[PDB]
DNA sequence: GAGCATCCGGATCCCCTGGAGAATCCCGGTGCCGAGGCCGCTCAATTGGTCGTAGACAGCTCTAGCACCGCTTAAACGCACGTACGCGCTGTCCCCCGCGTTTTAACCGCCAAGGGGATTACTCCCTAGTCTCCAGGCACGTGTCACATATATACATCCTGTTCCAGTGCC
DNA sequence: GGCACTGGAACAGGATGTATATATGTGACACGTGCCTGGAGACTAGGGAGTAATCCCCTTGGCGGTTAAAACGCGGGGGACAGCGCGTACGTGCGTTTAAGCGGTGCTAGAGCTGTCTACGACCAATTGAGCGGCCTCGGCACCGGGATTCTCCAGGGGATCCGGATGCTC
């Protein structure tokens, strides 16, 4: 008996099968992916936290997250992320 | 209204003064336009951050504190104009 | 008596867990209160990021004729993309190596 | 015959003069014109606090003098005293710019 | 019949405000719980830092025959100690200038 | 009258007045001090939150911020600042 | 129990291999001891941070996630070790 | 007469091999011995998870690789092909150490 | 008496150094505006008490980290010969500093005007929180084929022997 | 002036090292399964936040004057740099020692899970006194001005050196 440990294996696996039905992973590569997603999540969340600090807003919104993405992500990665997140927010709002 | 050429406003004697502050003994003639380009790169890199904070703040005017944030995000923190 | 439970990731049409990332923000001590759409937006951003980097990794592995991705392929993916390298200039990948990169003067003749 | 200093003498006196001093080196109004020119390329009709301009200035001379200190070190590493564009490119690449 | 309102900064025997810093951590969003000794420790360490840097600024001002501190004194104070340089490697001081420093090969024979 | 802008100037006047009763202050230098103390405060508070997360501790205490000072502030100031802080927290322990 | 001189345990051919991965084709013989010193200082910094983290953990055993915390706080972040 | 390559051709060969390769370049057991030896100076009786030692080994290897390619840039900047220690002090001091 | 040696004195050539200008420092002199301190306000720290809960402690367990050990070569090392490179000198050429003269726009400073920060009020949209319920991710088992390893061909490459050719010295 | 001698350039071929094709096992990747706790659903309280109104303040716009900075041109000296020689210092190849590395085993220290509770700390009403806005004065300092000191560059003066003449000695 051990305590359950959180992971992103199944979600990244689904995304990989979505982009590449025929490809596999190594476990070391998955460790890099977990470190990657946790790292980017930490970066964006902390940046949004200080934006919430700076406008004295005690509420964080997707506008703040979008500001952080445009601020941190270089180039068209930012605007692609804004497009995808905007679509997700709209179809979540409709659902 | 619109502006088209102000990179030459950083004059060659001004760049010479900057080099004298940096301890530069001799300055080539090819240095100045490169410093204009590099300075342009840095100022645009920080001012895109600054305008991002200003549009997020729902303000139309650029404030100094946002510029301080924009420099400290790249770890080039400037002291004395906060608050 | 009660409606069927429907996952919020399916509402956003996303693979990344809306509820888990929402909980992580709530216990991540970033704000006292979190808007509903912000974890959805963040999960979409991360899902796009992982999607593109996994596409690059799969293409690199297909170049290497391997069906399973390797940390070497990940290093090749990060450093051969300028924009991700600008995102990740300060990161270190375990067992990744570096790009094949020889300075031109180092070559003979 | 009028007095004329040897090359580098007035340069080193400039070194001491501008390095002991703290007062500004960039003419503030052509700089502010450049700032507004770059700003209007991203969002139109931006208005500037004067202190925002000032900070943008202090930071720029800070970044530049960091580059020329690095440039001087790499140039004396290169057994020269005259700086060349490949040296500034080298300094930016070593900094990861 | 309440006792006289005496202050925690005086209770630690320190000049920096314990209550303001405690409040600033409480709504600075670093934890939901905070101990009482942490703002005391924090006020102490910032007072020590300001004390030593103000010592250096005062000596720099007196060496330049000034009875009022200037940011040039602050720059000369921070840059003349290597350990504060490791504290402040990436920090910009407004109107500070740089240290008087000429490379030895630049000097004439 | 204008709404209050809280700042850290007068405490700097008091501590300097202890260490140097004679000297004067320029105001932009005083702003540089406020930037110093706010910057160091944010660094130490961020490290405190990070360590409270890593030990999964809900409470910010003196002991982990001591750990954070040993991390961020180097060497001689680190050990001396530890000394004054321990003296201060023992004095507050004695009320 | 006590180990005394493992600094030369980082052998010369290992440094040659690292220079090969670094893209160096020709390496002076006067390089290796300063590279040992630079590696030495870097490892001192990271394990000092690591033992500080571990001593906060009240553990006698250093662990990997504490090490990667020490690296990211030093600005040399690692992936692939439970991050 | 036995075969012998001219110098550098071999060197470029293991440059290609090792820059292609992914494995760790330094010996393992002296690296645990060294990290135990130096961690002995800060605190007594330390125990090391092997994963932590491997992570330290990878971090050290990447840091040295980055330092070495920076010294490569410095050396080709000085129109030489052989590195010398002042390249390393230059690269570190430009980097900020 | 004459020839030689040698010492002294002047010619000459190369190397130092004092002198004059000038740029900055330093000492007064003046007038000025930021700093420092006093005063009035206000809001935030403090006091006290309460209730809830987070971590310290104890205890147990199991697991992984260390220690010992025995082969087993891979690798470290070292030496030797060789050839490529750092570097120093030196000539050469041209690029930028010094300096002077002319242009100009930077800056002060002065005045008009309005765009927006920003600040208070209002009313409301959203979200933490609680309770219940349930299903997706984790633990864990299993099996299995992608890849590491091994061996046999195959070609790049890389250096040197072979062959044809141009520039130049002596009869 | 030509033929022989010496240095140049192109070419082929062997040996090696790396790729590459195919056989094989194996263990780490991938999938099936129990579960339970973390996610979802519904309702509530309530509160931060969006928005309307204002105002004033701080930014923007413009206009005269002056000058210091900028800019252009001449000159030259200084510095980059190319090329050649030279001595060296690793590079590479062959042999050797060793010590890392792998497989195996035992002990255990401490990492980590679980139960208790008790210290400790957020929450809230009252209140007040510490801390910040407003103001006002003045003296530390910015600006101006003149003399000293120090730096710098040069034209010249001074020392070093060598050779010729005289003279005394000596044969």
XYZ file of C-alpha atoms (C1' of nucleotides) in Angstrom, chain J residues 4-164:
161
model
C 67.757 19.668 -66.312
C 66.427 20.378 -61.484
C 63.011 21.481 -58.170
C 58.524 22.684 -56.586
C 53.104 22.258 -57.873
C 48.692 19.914 -58.974
C 45.743 16.281 -60.257
C 44.701 11.557 -59.687
C 43.859 6.518 -57.870
C 43.679 3.220 -54.380
C 43.770 0.954 -49.864
C 42.516 0.823 -45.036
C 39.796 2.123 -41.831
C 35.581 3.583 -39.646
C 31.055 4.329 -39.796
C 26.758 3.090 -41.835
C 23.293 -0.771 -42.953
C 20.832 -5.344 -43.250
C 19.224 -8.986 -40.693
C 18.644 -12.263 -36.548
C 17.246 -12.379 -31.589
C 15.602 -11.736 -26.862
C 13.783 -8.813 -23.337
C 12.059 -5.767 -20.540
C 9.919 -1.543 -20.577
C 5.813 0.145 -22.880
C 1.055 -0.684 -23.314
C -3.309 -2.425 -22.066
C -6.933 -4.735 -18.861
C -8.955 -4.224 -14.112
C -10.399 -2.855 -8.882
C -11.185 1.266 -6.589
C -11.819 5.524 -4.168
C -11.209 9.869 -3.752
C -11.180 13.730 -6.304
C -14.201 15.780 -9.545
C -19.068 17.101 -10.561
C -23.894 18.942 -9.442
C -27.054 21.930 -6.897
C -28.098 25.805 -3.810
C -26.655 29.916 -0.892
C -24.264 34.125 0.775
C -22.168 37.457 -0.314
C -18.955 40.111 -2.171
C -15.284 41.923 -5.721
C -15.975 43.938 -9.754
C -17.932 46.342 -13.861
C -19.909 50.695 -14.850
C -21.682 55.733 -14.521
C -20.191 60.475 -13.217
C -16.777 63.929 -12.314
C -12.517 66.455 -11.872
C -8.561 67.742 -12.059
C -4.269 66.813 -13.067
C -1.132 65.464 -15.621
C -0.267 64.888 -20.174
C -0.275 66.942 -24.909
C 0.291 70.757 -28.158
C 2.560 74.981 -29.646
C 5.963 79.177 -29.859
C 10.291 82.196 -29.047
C 15.488 82.158 -27.987
C 19.891 80.383 -27.218
C 23.223 77.723 -27.251
C 25.609 73.477 -26.681
C 25.481 69.588 -28.972
C 25.713 67.859 -33.509
C 27.733 67.580 -37.800
C 31.181 68.148 -41.500
C 35.898 68.471 -42.938
C 41.333 67.960 -42.632
C 44.995 65.821 -40.927
C 47.596 62.432 -39.166
C 49.035 59.186 -36.144
C 47.718 54.906 -34.275
C 45.944 50.369 -34.638
C 44.250 46.421 -37.193
C 46.081 43.054 -39.854
C 48.628 39.987 -43.151
C 52.506 37.198 -43.631
C 56.506 34.528 -42.210
C 59.184 32.064 -38.995
C 59.692 29.388 -34.937
C 59.388 26.614 -31.168
C 56.295 24.314 -28.857
C 52.310 21.308 -27.098
C 48.797 18.556 -27.482
C 46.832 14.693 -30.843
C 46.932 10.348 -31.918
C 48.456 5.709 -31.643
C 50.290 1.662 -28.921
C 50.819 -0.606 -24.598
C 49.674 -0.979 -19.532
C 47.025 -0.657 -14.679
C 43.517 -0.178 -12.650
C 39.336 0.584 -10.950
C 34.682 1.428 -12.390
C 30.932 -1.349 -13.362
C 27.870 -5.196 -12.948
C 25.813 -9.049 -10.392
C 24.707 -10.625 -5.656
C 23.681 -10.335 -0.537
C 22.861 -8.499 3.956
C 21.551 -4.510 7.454
C 19.421 -1.092 8.459
C 18.242 4.089 9.013
C 15.274 6.660 7.971
C 11.362 7.874 4.686
C 7.068 7.739 5.054
C 2.118 6.519 6.681
C -1.107 6.707 10.651
C -3.267 8.270 15.082
C -3.447 12.346 18.878
C -3.771 16.510 20.374
C -2.391 20.804 21.698
C -0.292 24.742 20.617
C -1.160 28.269 17.514
C -3.187 31.184 14.662
C -7.012 33.401 11.741
C -11.462 36.395 12.859
C -13.672 40.240 14.749
C -15.290 44.613 17.769
C -12.948 48.879 19.952
C -9.774 51.859 19.958
C -6.090 54.678 19.628
C -1.552 56.326 18.245
C 1.744 55.698 14.652
C 2.182 57.083 10.156
C 1.147 59.945 6.161
C -0.645 64.593 3.692
C 0.207 69.871 4.019
C 3.232 73.447 4.854
C 7.336 76.315 5.705
C 11.754 77.353 6.446
C 17.210 77.193 5.371
C 21.205 75.417 4.707
C 23.435 71.885 1.935
C 24.282 72.172 -2.308
C 24.190 73.796 -7.417
C 26.189 77.358 -10.077
C 29.869 80.906 -10.822
C 34.532 82.537 -10.636
C 39.558 82.659 -9.947
C 43.972 80.548 -8.728
C 47.066 75.914 -8.181
C 48.164 71.747 -9.377
C 48.927 68.293 -12.375
C 49.106 66.223 -17.107
C 51.055 66.291 -21.563
C 53.961 67.054 -25.522
C 57.730 69.010 -27.418
C 62.119 71.405 -28.464
C 66.054 71.432 -26.800
C 69.974 70.368 -23.749
C 72.875 66.991 -21.702
C 75.370 62.798 -21.434
C 77.802 59.028 -23.740
C 80.867 57.654 -26.797
C 84.677 57.410 -29.877
C 88.549 59.093 -32.237
C 92.502 62.141 -32.990
